[PDB]
Design a protein around this ligand. Structure first.
Ligand SMILES: COc1cc(N2CCCC2=O)ccc1Nc1nc(NC2CCCCC2)c2c(C#N)c[nH]c2n1
Length: 266
């Protein structure tokens, strides 16, 4: 029965999808019984940094949905000094949750097109995400749609039996730069996702120790395995995305002219 009004519309809370720092996301129904997601942010306590991060996400979300429908839509929002409410397109599920249920080749290359389109358009407006991973994409309408820009607070799914970030998607440049960053590091992370989507695992999901994992990612003399497969253009895509040198890695504009994307059958 718990409810939320935003501007002058009432919405019913079916459940809570997820939560993060000071944020919650709810699955809700509007008055005419249509389904939406609402993100809630409690601003009561909040640095001037995160305030600006939350303001920055809303503006980019509003700016970017005009240019692609592979970005989750922001329909309405309400922002005061105390709270934010954001009424948004509601996904069926996030791609990370879904991948952990163990893909038709054609759904896989359609999803890939979806991700490139979304990441390409945020690149055209000056954003490099930097921490792309499956959780950033939502399945809706049989498509993948991007939900974050790396900018704001990364939330996590709520379970109903209560229970930690991943690192399998981090590009080599990010690691070696602990001692601005390229559009090319989003290519790395997308390759890991596509790799996962094709070989059932991320390129270093075996190295269960995390510092030896970090070293593999950066190691020139540590080969990534690309088992032969029927779709050889999919093999090529993975090979070029997962080049360690960002300068030699394939770019998004190149990926969009690649045969895996352009020739429509396997
Ligand atoms: C019923 O919908 C879902 C269900 C589930 N899950 C996961 C496992 C079990 C389950 O049911 C996952 C996502 C959705 N849909 C959905 N989630 C969103 N956020 C989640 C938060 C936690 C991290 C992922 C993204 C948003 C959003 C924002 N911000 C704008 N629109 C959205 N839509």
């Amino acid at each position: 029965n718990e409810c939320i009004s935003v501007k002058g519309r009432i919405y019913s809370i079916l459940k809570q999808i997820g939560s993060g720092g000071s944020s919650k996301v709810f699955q809700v129904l509007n008055e005419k019984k249509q389904i939406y997601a609402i993100k809630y942010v409690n601003l009561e306590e909040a640095d001037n940094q995160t305030l600006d991060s939350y303001r920055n996400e809303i503006a980019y979300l509003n700016k970017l949905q005009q240019h692609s429908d592979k970005i989750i839509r922001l329909y309405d929002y309400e922002i005061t000094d105390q709270y934010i409410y954001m009424v948004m397109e509601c996904g069926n599920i996030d791609l990370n949750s879904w991948l952990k249920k163990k893909i038709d080749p054609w759904e896989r290359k359609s999803y890939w097109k979806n991700m490139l389109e979304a990441v390409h358009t945020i690149h055209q407006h000056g954003i490099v995400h930097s921490d792309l991973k499956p959780a950033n994409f939502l399945i809706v309408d049989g498509m993948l749609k991007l939900i974050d820009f790396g900018i704001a607070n990364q939330m996590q799914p709520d379970t109903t039996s209560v229970v930690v970030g991943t690192v399998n998607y981090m590009p080599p440049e990010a690691i070696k730069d602990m001692s601005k960053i390229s559009p090319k590091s989003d290519v790395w992370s997308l390759g890991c996702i596509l790799y996962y989507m094709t070989y059932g695992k991320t390129p270093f999901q075996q190295i269960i120790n995390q510092i030896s994992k970090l070293h593999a990612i950066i190691d020139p003399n540590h080969e990534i395995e690309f088992p032969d497969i029927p779709e050889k253009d999919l093999q090529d895509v993975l090979k070029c995305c997962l080049k360690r040198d960002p300068k030699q890695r394939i770019s998004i504009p190149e990926l969009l002219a690649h045969p895996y994307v352009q020739i429509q059958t396997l």
